[PDB]
Symmetry: C3
Subunit: 146 residues, 3 copies
Amino acid sequence: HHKDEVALLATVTLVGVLLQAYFSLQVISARRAFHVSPPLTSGPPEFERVFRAQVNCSEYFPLFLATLWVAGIFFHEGAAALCGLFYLFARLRYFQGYARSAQLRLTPLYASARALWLLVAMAALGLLVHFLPGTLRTALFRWLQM
Amino acid sequence: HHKDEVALLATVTLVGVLLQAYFSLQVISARRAFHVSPPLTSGPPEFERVFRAQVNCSEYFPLFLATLWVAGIFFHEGAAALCGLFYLFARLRYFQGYARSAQLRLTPLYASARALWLLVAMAALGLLVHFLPGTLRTALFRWLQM
Amino acid sequence: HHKDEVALLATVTLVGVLLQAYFSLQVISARRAFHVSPPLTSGPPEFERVFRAQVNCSEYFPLFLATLWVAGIFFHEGAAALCGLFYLFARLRYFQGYARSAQLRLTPLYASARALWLLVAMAALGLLVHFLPGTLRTALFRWLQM
Ligand SMILES: N[C@@H](CCC(=O)N[C@@H](CS)C(=O)NCC(=O)O)C(=O)O
Ligand SMILES: N[C@@H](CCC(=O)N[C@@H](CS)C(=O)NCC(=O)O)C(=O)O
Ligand SMILES: N[C@@H](CCC(=O)N[C@@H](CS)C(=O)NCC(=O)O)C(=O)O
Ligand code: NI
């Protein structure tokens, strides 16, 4: 069982899945409430905003997962998991904002981006540590001989 | 080689990839058959249904992968892999249905959702086992002293 | 630290994330330059091409990641990481092409597909090795007795 060091990342991943499923069900009820039957992704602006919120989130979702894992494995699991929650939480506000007003989406989008960029930075710092000693070591072997 | 305990999850993942690529090629031929040249995602309803089937699947695809892995790692690899196949198979019927009729998409969608929700439940049960003993143990440490 | 055998896959994954974020920022500036304010995903053809490039890439992105990991784990990490870069690089040209001309997207798309199909083949070959000995062995146990 090599699970222990990874269960926080996996559980935030699962919260992310539930959240995405939440958005998807919301599109189904807005699909019914405004008579917009499949296919067709157009209708009144209330519907379109809800469609687009869902689509937007589901497009950043893999970015989120990728960096969440790389940051959690290469930097620190708990911090990664923590930005993970901010991110997910900001994205819940993004969706709820977007639905009432397109302008009211902007505040939680900006919060979602900070969290997400933090994961990226952590990931980048994590990989730098892994890789940079090994390669500075041998860059210094050029200069021998000597 | 820590591959052994994970190869079923990886191979279902690969079936999922081939399946998504299958859908994508189908959109290319429907793009040609109805003269709908990039960009533009609109045309006759036969084309639109095929475009939307592909888009729908490719939106649930990461959810699928995430839960497939978490369920396979934290609950049981073979069962996860098994819902994985039902899911993938249901999604193949979803796509083939949607293309002929939008109503004929509904039966395999409902099957895809059951499989997918099963993976989620398995994942949730898996994480509960990992986390809940550790935390009940120490919740019981509050009540000592004693 | 079981990081060492996986850091190349993780770092290409991170390049992929930065690249996707690059595309997303490009859509934001084309959204401003042609006054196409959220929601609405339609406008002049310059804008639509840029929207679609981003969407296209972000749809293949999970396929890419999945096969990149399975190929890197089950076949060989460095080769997988190498197709990974070709793929990512081809996808950068795809996006830059698509934006100026829809026809000028085709050359880097074709390069992105070769790289991606190579990862799939490598993955398929990797899983074959894992699975096929174990099962030929026991297929040969049918024919004993003997
Ligand atoms: N992206 C989906 C989100 C919700 C969903 O899963 N809808 C199901 C059931 S109504 C569907 O099959 N939608 C058809 C489609 O994606 O065009 C949508 O636009 O409807
Ligand atoms: N989502 C894609 C699925 C198939 C695909 O990969 N098409 C390629 C070659 S025709 C493409 O570059 N499509 C342009 C686009 O996505 O707008 C589509 O709508 O065409
Ligand atoms: N798919 C996005 C890519 C770029 C993006 O992230 N845009 C942000 C800020 S303008 C957004 O909230 N777009 C609203 C939407 O996706 O409809 C888009 O179409 O705009
Ligand atoms: Ni280990």
